[PDB]
Design a protein around this ligand. Structure first.
Ligand SMILES: [K+]
Ligand SMILES: [K+]
Ligand SMILES: [K+]
Ligand SMILES: [K+]
Ligand SMILES: [K+]
Ligand SMILES: [K+]
Ligand SMILES: [K+]
Ligand SMILES: [K+]
Ligand SMILES: [K+]
Ligand SMILES: [K+]
Ligand SMILES: [K+]
Ligand SMILES: [K+]
Ligand SMILES: [K+]
Ligand SMILES: [K+]
Ligand SMILES: [K+]
Ligand SMILES: [K+]
Ligand SMILES: [K+]
Ligand SMILES: [K+]
Ligand SMILES: [K+]
Ligand SMILES: [K+]
Ligand SMILES: [K+]
Ligand SMILES: [K+]
Ligand SMILES: [K+]
Ligand SMILES: [K+]
Ligand SMILES: [K+]
Ligand SMILES: [K+]
Ligand SMILES: [K+]
Ligand SMILES: [K+]
Ligand SMILES: [K+]
Ligand SMILES: [K+]
Ligand SMILES: [K+]
Ligand SMILES: [K+]
Ligand SMILES: [K+]
Ligand SMILES: [K+]
Ligand SMILES: [K+]
Ligand SMILES: [K+]
Ligand SMILES: [K+]
Ligand SMILES: [K+]
Ligand SMILES: [K+]
Ligand SMILES: [K+]
Ligand SMILES: [K+]
Ligand SMILES: [K+]
Ligand SMILES: [K+]
Ligand SMILES: [K+]
Ligand SMILES: [K+]
Ligand SMILES: [K+]
Ligand SMILES: [Mg+2]
Ligand SMILES: [Mg+2]
Ligand SMILES: [Mg+2]
Ligand SMILES: [Mg+2]
Ligand SMILES: [Mg+2]
Ligand SMILES: [Mg+2]
Ligand SMILES: [Mg+2]
Ligand SMILES: [Mg+2]
Ligand SMILES: [Mg+2]
Ligand SMILES: [Mg+2]
Ligand SMILES: [Mg+2]
Ligand SMILES: [Mg+2]
Ligand SMILES: [Mg+2]
Ligand SMILES: [Mg+2]
Ligand SMILES: [Mg+2]
Ligand SMILES: [Mg+2]
Ligand SMILES: [Mg+2]
Ligand SMILES: [Mg+2]
Ligand SMILES: [Mg+2]
Ligand SMILES: [Mg+2]
Ligand SMILES: [Mg+2]
Ligand SMILES: [Mg+2]
Ligand SMILES: [Mg+2]
Ligand SMILES: [Mg+2]
Ligand SMILES: [Mg+2]
Ligand SMILES: [Mg+2]
Ligand SMILES: [Mg+2]
Ligand SMILES: [Mg+2]
Ligand SMILES: [Mg+2]
Ligand SMILES: [Mg+2]
Ligand SMILES: [Mg+2]
Ligand SMILES: [Mg+2]
Ligand SMILES: [Mg+2]
Ligand SMILES: [Mg+2]
Ligand SMILES: [Mg+2]
Ligand SMILES: [Mg+2]
Ligand SMILES: [Mg+2]
Ligand SMILES: [Mg+2]
Ligand SMILES: [Mg+2]
Ligand SMILES: [Mg+2]
Ligand SMILES: [Mg+2]
Ligand SMILES: [Mg+2]
Ligand SMILES: [Mg+2]
Ligand SMILES: [Mg+2]
Ligand SMILES: [Mg+2]
Ligand SMILES: [Mg+2]
Ligand SMILES: [Mg+2]
Ligand SMILES: [Mg+2]
Ligand SMILES: [Mg+2]
Ligand SMILES: [Mg+2]
Ligand SMILES: [Mg+2]
Ligand SMILES: [Mg+2]
Ligand SMILES: [Mg+2]
Ligand SMILES: [Mg+2]
Ligand SMILES: [Mg+2]
Ligand SMILES: [Mg+2]
Ligand SMILES: [Mg+2]
Ligand SMILES: [Mg+2]
Ligand SMILES: [Mg+2]
Ligand SMILES: [Mg+2]
Ligand SMILES: [Mg+2]
Ligand SMILES: [Mg+2]
Ligand SMILES: [Mg+2]
Ligand SMILES: [Mg+2]
Ligand SMILES: [Mg+2]
Ligand SMILES: [Mg+2]
Ligand SMILES: [Mg+2]
Ligand SMILES: [Mg+2]
Ligand SMILES: [Mg+2]
Ligand SMILES: [Mg+2]
Ligand SMILES: [Mg+2]
Ligand SMILES: [Mg+2]
Ligand SMILES: [Mg+2]
Ligand SMILES: [Mg+2]
Ligand SMILES: [Mg+2]
Ligand SMILES: [Mg+2]
Ligand SMILES: [Mg+2]
Ligand SMILES: [Mg+2]
Ligand SMILES: [Mg+2]
Ligand SMILES: [Mg+2]
Ligand SMILES: [Mg+2]
Ligand SMILES: [Mg+2]
Ligand SMILES: [Mg+2]
Ligand SMILES: [Mg+2]
Ligand SMILES: [Mg+2]
Ligand SMILES: [Mg+2]
Ligand SMILES: [Mg+2]
Ligand SMILES: [Mg+2]
Ligand SMILES: [Mg+2]
Ligand SMILES: [Mg+2]
Ligand SMILES: [Mg+2]
Ligand SMILES: [Mg+2]
Ligand SMILES: [Mg+2]
Ligand SMILES: [Mg+2]
Ligand SMILES: [Mg+2]
Ligand SMILES: [Mg+2]
Ligand SMILES: [Mg+2]
Ligand SMILES: [Mg+2]
Ligand SMILES: [Mg+2]
Ligand SMILES: [Mg+2]
Ligand SMILES: [Mg+2]
Ligand SMILES: [Mg+2]
Ligand SMILES: [Mg+2]
Ligand SMILES: [Mg+2]
Ligand SMILES: [Mg+2]
Ligand SMILES: [Mg+2]
Ligand SMILES: [Mg+2]
Ligand SMILES: [Mg+2]
Ligand SMILES: [Mg+2]
Ligand SMILES: [Mg+2]
Ligand SMILES: [Mg+2]
Ligand SMILES: [Mg+2]
Ligand SMILES: [Mg+2]
Ligand SMILES: [Mg+2]
Ligand SMILES: [Mg+2]
Ligand SMILES: [Mg+2]
Ligand SMILES: [Mg+2]
Ligand SMILES: [Mg+2]
Ligand SMILES: [Mg+2]
Ligand SMILES: [Mg+2]
Ligand SMILES: [Mg+2]
Ligand SMILES: [Mg+2]
Ligand SMILES: [Mg+2]
Ligand SMILES: [Mg+2]
Ligand SMILES: [Mg+2]
Ligand SMILES: [Mg+2]
Ligand SMILES: [Mg+2]
Ligand SMILES: [Mg+2]
Ligand SMILES: [Mg+2]
Ligand SMILES: [Mg+2]
Ligand SMILES: [Mg+2]
Ligand SMILES: [Mg+2]
Ligand SMILES: [Mg+2]
Ligand SMILES: [Mg+2]
Ligand SMILES: [Mg+2]
Ligand SMILES: [Mg+2]
Ligand SMILES: [Mg+2]
Ligand SMILES: [Mg+2]
Ligand SMILES: [Mg+2]
Ligand SMILES: [Mg+2]
Ligand SMILES: [Mg+2]
Ligand SMILES: [Mg+2]
Ligand SMILES: [Mg+2]
Ligand SMILES: [Mg+2]
Ligand SMILES: [Mg+2]
Lengths: 48, 272
RNA sequence: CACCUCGAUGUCGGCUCGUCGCAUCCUGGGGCUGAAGAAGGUCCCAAGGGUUGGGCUGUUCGCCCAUUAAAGCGGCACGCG
RNA sequence: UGCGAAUGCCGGCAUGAGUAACGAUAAAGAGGGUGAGAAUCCCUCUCGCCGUAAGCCCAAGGGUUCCUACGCAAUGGUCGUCAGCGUAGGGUUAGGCGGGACCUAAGGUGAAGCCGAAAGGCGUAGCCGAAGGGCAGCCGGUUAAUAUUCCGGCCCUUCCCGCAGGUGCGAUGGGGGGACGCUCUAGGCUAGGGGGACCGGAGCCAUGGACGAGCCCGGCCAGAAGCGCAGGGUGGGAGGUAGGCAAAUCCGCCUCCCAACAAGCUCUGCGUGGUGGGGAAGCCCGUACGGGUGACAACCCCCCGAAGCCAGGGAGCCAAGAAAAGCCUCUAAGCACAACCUGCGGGAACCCGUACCGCAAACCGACACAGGUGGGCGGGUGCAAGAGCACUCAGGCGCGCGGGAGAACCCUCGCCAAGGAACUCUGCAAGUUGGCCCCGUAACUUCGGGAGAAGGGGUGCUCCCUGGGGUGAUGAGCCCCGGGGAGCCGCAGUGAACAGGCUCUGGCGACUGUUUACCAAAAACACAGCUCUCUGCGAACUCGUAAGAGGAGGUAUAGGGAGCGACGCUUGCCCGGUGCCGGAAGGUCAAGGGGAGGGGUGCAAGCCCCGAACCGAAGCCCCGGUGAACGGCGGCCGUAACUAUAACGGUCCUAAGGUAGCGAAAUUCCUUGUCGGGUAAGUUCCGACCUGCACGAAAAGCGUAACGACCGGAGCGCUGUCUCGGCGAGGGACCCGGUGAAAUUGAACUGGCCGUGAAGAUGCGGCCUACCCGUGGCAGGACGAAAAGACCCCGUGGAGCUUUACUGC
RNA sequence: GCGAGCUAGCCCUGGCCAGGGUGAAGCUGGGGUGAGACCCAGUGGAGGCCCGAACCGGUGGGGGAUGCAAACCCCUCGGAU
RNA sequence: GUGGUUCGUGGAGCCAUGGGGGAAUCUGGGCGGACCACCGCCUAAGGCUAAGUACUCCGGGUGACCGAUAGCGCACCAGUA
RNA sequence: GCCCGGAUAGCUCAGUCGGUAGAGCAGGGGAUUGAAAAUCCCCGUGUCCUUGGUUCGAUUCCGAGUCCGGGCACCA
RNA sequence: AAUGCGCAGAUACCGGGAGGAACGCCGAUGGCGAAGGCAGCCACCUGGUCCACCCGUGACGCUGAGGCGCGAAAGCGUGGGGAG
């Protein structure tokens, strides 16, 4: 049937994107933690 | 006058639509229409603050004149009477002689062509707005300002009307469509007559769908829910109220009075 | 009563499939009779085989309808998911 | 710091086992080629399948999967020489297509401003934001792979700078416009389609016949100006002018005029059109595929015809149907040796996307997964129509294991003698019925329905006659709707396929709707409608600490809350308790006020403690009201001239003791109540009675036409449902070749009976049976597997829910 | 702190619903009357109207149950301005 | 009305402060645990101030610390697949 | 089968601190009436259900028993 | 008599206001209408009737099954109103 992943490149960057994170202090802290852990990508990989 | 239907389908038995005879113009005054944001009952957080609201025909706001003194003594000819999807009443389009066109809420009796005018001058005739203090006692009157220059706010629904009962200094004694007796300041404007489209109260929607067209979504009884949702929810089968009848927010809903007692306006009220 | 089983022994009835017991419903053998005959009554031997189709109710049971030599009772985790 | 257990952790390797599977029952066969190797790759022929798709084009998503060359370890459910796989190389070209140097929508953001302990929340303008608005490219050819992108032909747009000619020019400001619903719809066209006796074309004459106006193939596409043919939009002048937040000559308003179902201006569509392209079958080409020829190809006539175009067309209706820019006009500063407008020239015209998949082996589903995925095209013939069904074009496919075999059993399917629900919880299932035309059609009804009620008759082909339409012309042709009469053949003419079984009677719910994604679709929710209640507008109410927002740019014919749930006839009594409402008195009552009077220290002046009256709100008490507010709505004894029963009486209690109507009911325990009906037989069903365990009037009472994948009872029709089974088909199951799992598993050399044993033993006792090992089958046992039982209890375990439990907010 | 790319509601903007039936009002004509109501025709084309694809569903049954599938398949069924 | 302190209203002071009231400048004020008296200590409502103290992303030195299931999650292109 | 309530005049019922117990109706006797009612005057019988026990004394207090009324019989 | 109302300030009295219904005297055994029925006062629209005159038409008449219209009170529907 219709599964839970309905990909939408705008959705992805609008929701979990770098500019998305940087507005909320909750999301800036997401980057903080992700960098401190040394993730290769802080934000989900997206393609305009 | 009001249209009925033959029962060629169920819900057409009892369906009833208004009589659009007094309607003269179909498309509205383009220079006098705004778009209205449809809330679906949601506030500026994305939350519902009025339940069971949404859907319903797209509507275009007719910007209408509730302050009539900004054209004192300038008369105008009643050009049209048109449908307004945003109120119970019908609106009248009037062409002022100086070329401005405005929407007035159309009183009963008013028909196309007559002169109309606002101001302490004005003749006491249907359509004319005047400060209350110059409107003779016992005159039925609508679209009443509640405080001077704050705009008309009283009796503007179909077939509503206030009536002047007496005078007291700067105030005058009004009987409102709700039977309440209130003093209103004499300087408050009010166009004379009653609202009209007076048969609005007889239209019988007919089917559930017709409620949807007015943007009224279904409304579910507390008794139909569970205790998490409503004070009346739960039980086994059906179940009586089992307590003083209450709203979803737990306050009593039979008789319990809610006007703030300490309200300053209490000084100017005298009835029910 | 609370002995095995609550780190699980699926619970009524039906259907299918049976198998055994006998305290025998029928058929077979018999004693007594308040047994003329015919039909019974009751007890004895006997478990080889047989032991119907329908209405009602989920029903087991039971009651009816129509037959029958007869429309036996039980046990097998109230046999068998 | 010593491991055997912890349904312990990690890893490795077993068992089941060469076992189940190899992923749609659309289907294959042969020949040639290639290669170490071929059922599986290439090619030919034959066969099958899709064809409102299983073909083609967009969008999203994916991201090199595209093309070529070389490969086969692995991935591919087998094989592989093949690949969506490995290696390498190549490949995606735009002023006009999509998007950005344009607009605004919800929403987001957000100068000003408002709010919040901090983080932050709000917020007019502005900005951002699109599958909406605006805006200039069509068609062929070319490549292994791109093309509206390169090329060719023809045609446009914008910017800049010049000329030339015009005009008071000129905004982010004023106005017009853009600009709008649903349903139905006229005319004229276009796409698209069919026919042709005509134009063109290789060829063919088979097998009995046919050299014929024979068969087969094709007969077009893009196209500026100008011309037509349709349609859409729009009145022309003069005065007055206080409105459009300055100013307008513009708009609006007023008054004059001329004009008026038009015209004339425009604007779009369609046709023609310079020119430019295409151009079959077949046949020969060697391509996996394209080329050559057919050819100087022909390129016409008729008919059908949109849902598309003219389009802002028209009519009706109510629920009353975005915005902003481009665009036109108007004026303001400013400037008028500027500027703008109109043509014509030359120049200038950037960023990104463009491969390939794209109903799927490339997207979402862990898989080359029988699932899921939006827009457009979607031909032909027939069937009443149609996107329906059957076949079929273009195109695409045979589903990435095969070969046999011909058991049980399984699945999907076909038929069945006699019977026809006897099956069973239940006609579950399957059957029957089925399209169109015509005849006909009841109770009841809210007059619409019920109705497709029910039940019938017809349906093919041939010849003769014959009436209308549309198109041509009033005429022929081509279509479309028919009507009459003769006759032909079969078991059968909606000859295949698609296509209701019907009646009667109850319960519930008025109705179409809605719901437990994934065991409940319902009598549950909703619903129009009825009542109660709140709420005078900075409304009540809701969200938020707040600002603020929704309510509502609404105003008592309105909005919120509660119940009841079309409609019909109705909705009785009880206000003692609880709740809500009203009570300017009284009692009580907290802080506060007030201080009689006591007290501690000081030598005192003092300082400092308590503190009685009395004045003190809401609340409670108290007095009333209130039932579509929470709710409630009796007992015992007696009595009538046969009995029986009790209209009548007595008396106890209560706030008052259940009215109409209904009643063994979705309520009736006793119960299969009793009577009637249906049946041969009826714990069901229907009608009744009333003894109502334990109905009863808006948690509504009793009815009600119509509706229902709801639930019950009856019957007809018809059946493999059954007596009661049989045969057959295919897909599996079986054998062979290839690949090859799973839960489970203390170890096993794992029989029966009667006992015993923790009380149901392969494992102990006695006895009895019994050569070793497999294969196809069945399921009685291994208290078989699966899940640390969901029932039950326990734990001073946990959670959801309630309230006159406690305590708080 | 992260989630409405599934799902529920609402908001903005677009799109879809083959083909049949039924035949409300209104018109227009005729009758009717003092005038009407009303009646009959024809036209008209309304409806949470009817049949039925797409599309949205998920009624009954069978299959499936280490599945093709962690909700599928077949027949059947509901809605379809 | 509260917080802090050992101080949970307690005989409850001291320091802090949301609300109300509201002074004085040395013969002035605060404190020594209700309060008063005595006797003492201090000088509120302005500010700055090294060191001794805390920590370990990093550098070094050590180890009756590990030795690839240990030791950091990572000894290996790991916050990777 | 398991709990609670009651039993008093002929009927329906109050009642008690442990001593001689009343109400209403019915019934009886008188009155009024032509005669019945209705009205008026006057009149209780009670072994306070059975049985045991506490008392000086029990309808009263207690324990059982008959009888009646009410509530219960759940997961299963 | 009691229910009821009343020191929470009633009745009785004055003043202000709201509201609905019905129209005293005139008024009569009177008038009008076909009946049902009609009563303050003003206006508009409108029916019948009588009289005077003897002018017009010229039997155009009377009755009237059905049909159609009106029809006190009570009652019913949708709304409004609601003092007695
Ligand atoms: K509701
Ligand atoms: K409930
Ligand atoms: K157990
Ligand atoms: K036997
Ligand atoms: K047996
Ligand atoms: K089972
Ligand atoms: K282990
Ligand atoms: K093995
Ligand atoms: K390979
Ligand atoms: K596979
Ligand atoms: K756009
Ligand atoms: K402008
Ligand atoms: K042209
Ligand atoms: K391309
Ligand atoms: K097909
Ligand atoms: K075989
Ligand atoms: K049977
Ligand atoms: K059908
Ligand atoms: K039925
Ligand atoms: K009903
Ligand atoms: K349903
Ligand atoms: K529901
Ligand atoms: K608003
Ligand atoms: K009460
Ligand atoms: K009360
Ligand atoms: K009361
Ligand atoms: K005090
Ligand atoms: K009964
Ligand atoms: K009952
Ligand atoms: K009978
Ligand atoms: K009978
Ligand atoms: K249903
Ligand atoms: K077994
Ligand atoms: K406890
Ligand atoms: K229609
Ligand atoms: K303290
Ligand atoms: K201090
Ligand atoms: K001190
Ligand atoms: K000190
Ligand atoms: K410092
Ligand atoms: K290792
Ligand atoms: K590790
Ligand atoms: K009593
Ligand atoms: K007595
Ligand atoms: K008559
Ligand atoms: K009343
Ligand atoms: Mg997932
Ligand atoms: Mg890196
Ligand atoms: Mg506008
Ligand atoms: Mg519920
Ligand atoms: Mg919730
Ligand atoms: Mg609650
Ligand atoms: Mg409740
Ligand atoms: Mg529940
Ligand atoms: Mg209940
Ligand atoms: Mg109110
Ligand atoms: Mg035990
Ligand atoms: Mg076990
Ligand atoms: Mg036996
Ligand atoms: Mg024997
Ligand atoms: Mg036997
Ligand atoms: Mg039965
Ligand atoms: Mg029998
Ligand atoms: Mg037993
Ligand atoms: Mg037993
Ligand atoms: Mg059993
Ligand atoms: Mg081990
Ligand atoms: Mg390893
Ligand atoms: Mg095996
Ligand atoms: Mg096998
Ligand atoms: Mg196999
Ligand atoms: Mg396959
Ligand atoms: Mg071959
Ligand atoms: Mg082959
Ligand atoms: Mg394909
Ligand atoms: Mg992928
Ligand atoms: Mg390839
Ligand atoms: Mg190759
Ligand atoms: Mg392989
Ligand atoms: Mg390929
Ligand atoms: Mg490759
Ligand atoms: Mg630029
Ligand atoms: Mg913000
Ligand atoms: Mg913008
Ligand atoms: Mg666009
Ligand atoms: Mg091309
Ligand atoms: Mg390509
Ligand atoms: Mg091209
Ligand atoms: Mg100008
Ligand atoms: Mg064309
Ligand atoms: Mg054509
Ligand atoms: Mg055609
Ligand atoms: Mg030739
Ligand atoms: Mg021949
Ligand atoms: Mg020839
Ligand atoms: Mg020839
Ligand atoms: Mg063409
Ligand atoms: Mg003009
Ligand atoms: Mg101006
Ligand atoms: Mg024109
Ligand atoms: Mg050539
Ligand atoms: Mg139009
Ligand atoms: Mg702008
Ligand atoms: Mg040019
Ligand atoms: Mg492409
Ligand atoms: Mg593919
Ligand atoms: Mg493809
Ligand atoms: Mg493709
Ligand atoms: Mg598609
Ligand atoms: Mg494919
Ligand atoms: Mg494809
Ligand atoms: Mg495959
Ligand atoms: Mg697939
Ligand atoms: Mg996939
Ligand atoms: Mg097709
Ligand atoms: Mg056709
Ligand atoms: Mg057809
Ligand atoms: Mg098809
Ligand atoms: Mg083909
Ligand atoms: Mg397939
Ligand atoms: Mg048969
Ligand atoms: Mg037969
Ligand atoms: Mg028959
Ligand atoms: Mg039967
Ligand atoms: Mg069936
Ligand atoms: Mg069928
Ligand atoms: Mg009938
Ligand atoms: Mg009819
Ligand atoms: Mg009919
Ligand atoms: Mg034939
Ligand atoms: Mg059929
Ligand atoms: Mg149907
Ligand atoms: Mg029943
Ligand atoms: Mg329903
Ligand atoms: Mg329907
Ligand atoms: Mg469900
Ligand atoms: Mg659903
Ligand atoms: Mg189900
Ligand atoms: Mg279901
Ligand atoms: Mg607001
Ligand atoms: Mg209800
Ligand atoms: Mg004091
Ligand atoms: Mg008080
Ligand atoms: Mg009270
Ligand atoms: Mg009631
Ligand atoms: Mg009830
Ligand atoms: Mg009720
Ligand atoms: Mg109901
Ligand atoms: Mg009923
Ligand atoms: Mg009914
Ligand atoms: Mg339905
Ligand atoms: Mg069978
Ligand atoms: Mg067979
Ligand atoms: Mg095998
Ligand atoms: Mg052995
Ligand atoms: Mg044993
Ligand atoms: Mg041994
Ligand atoms: Mg031993
Ligand atoms: Mg042994
Ligand atoms: Mg043994
Ligand atoms: Mg075996
Ligand atoms: Mg074996
Ligand atoms: Mg088996
Ligand atoms: Mg087990
Ligand atoms: Mg468990
Ligand atoms: Mg357990
Ligand atoms: Mg459970
Ligand atoms: Mg506990
Ligand atoms: Mg606990
Ligand atoms: Mg979503
Ligand atoms: Mg959503
Ligand atoms: Mg419909
Ligand atoms: Mg349908
Ligand atoms: Mg479509
Ligand atoms: Mg869907
Ligand atoms: Mg299903
Ligand atoms: Mg369907
Ligand atoms: Mg503290
Ligand atoms: Mg001290
Ligand atoms: Mg070492
Ligand atoms: Mg490691
Ligand atoms: Mg490692
Ligand atoms: Mg007694
Ligand atoms: Mg005694
Ligand atoms: Mg008159
Ligand atoms: Mg004369
Ligand atoms: Mg009447
Ligand atoms: Mg009346
Ligand atoms: Mg009435
Ligand atoms: Mg009534
Ligand atoms: Mg009323």
């Amino acid at each position: 049937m219709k599964r839970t992943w309905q990909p939408n490149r705008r959705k992805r960057a609008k929701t979990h994107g770098f500019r998305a994170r940087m507005r909320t202090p909750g999301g800036r802290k997401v980057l903080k933690r992700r960098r401190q852990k040394g993730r290769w990508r802080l934000t989900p990989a997206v393609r305009k | 006058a009001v249209k009925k239907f033959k029962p060629y389908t169920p819900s057409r038995r009892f369906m009833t639509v208004a009589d659009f005879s007094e309607i003269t113009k179909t498309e509205p005054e383009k220079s006098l229409v705004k778009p209205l944001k449809k809330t679906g009952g949601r506030n500026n957080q994305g939350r519902i603050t009025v339940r069971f609201r949404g859907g319903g025909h797209k509507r275009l706001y007719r910007i209408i004149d509730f302050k009539r003194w900004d054209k004192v003594g300038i008369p105008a000819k009643v050009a049209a009477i048109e449908y307004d999807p945003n109120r119970s009443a019908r609106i009248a389009l009037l062409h002022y002689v100086d070329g401005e066109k405005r929407y007035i809420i159309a009183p009963d009796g008013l028909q196309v062509g007559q002169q109309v005018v606002a101001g302490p001058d004005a003749p006491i005739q249907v359509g004319n707005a005047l400060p209350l203090r110059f409107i003779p006692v016992g005159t039925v009157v609508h679209a009443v300002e509640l405080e001077p220059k704050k705009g008309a706010k009283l009796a503007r629904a179909a077939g509503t009307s206030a009536q002047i009962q007496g005078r007291e200094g700067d105030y005058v004694i009004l009987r409102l469509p709700s039977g309440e007796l209130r003093k209103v300041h004499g300087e408050c404007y009010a166009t004379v007559g009653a609202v009209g489209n007076a048969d609005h109260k007889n239209i019988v929607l007919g089917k559930a769908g017709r409620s949807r067209w007015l943007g009224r979504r279904p409304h579910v009884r507390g008794a139909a829910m569970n205790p998490v949702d409503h004070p009346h929810g739960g039980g086994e089968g059906r179940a009586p109220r089992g307590r003083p009848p209450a709203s979803p927010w737990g306050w009593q809903t039979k008789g319990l009075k809610t006007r703030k007692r300490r309200k300053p306006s209490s000084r100017f009220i005298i009835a029910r």
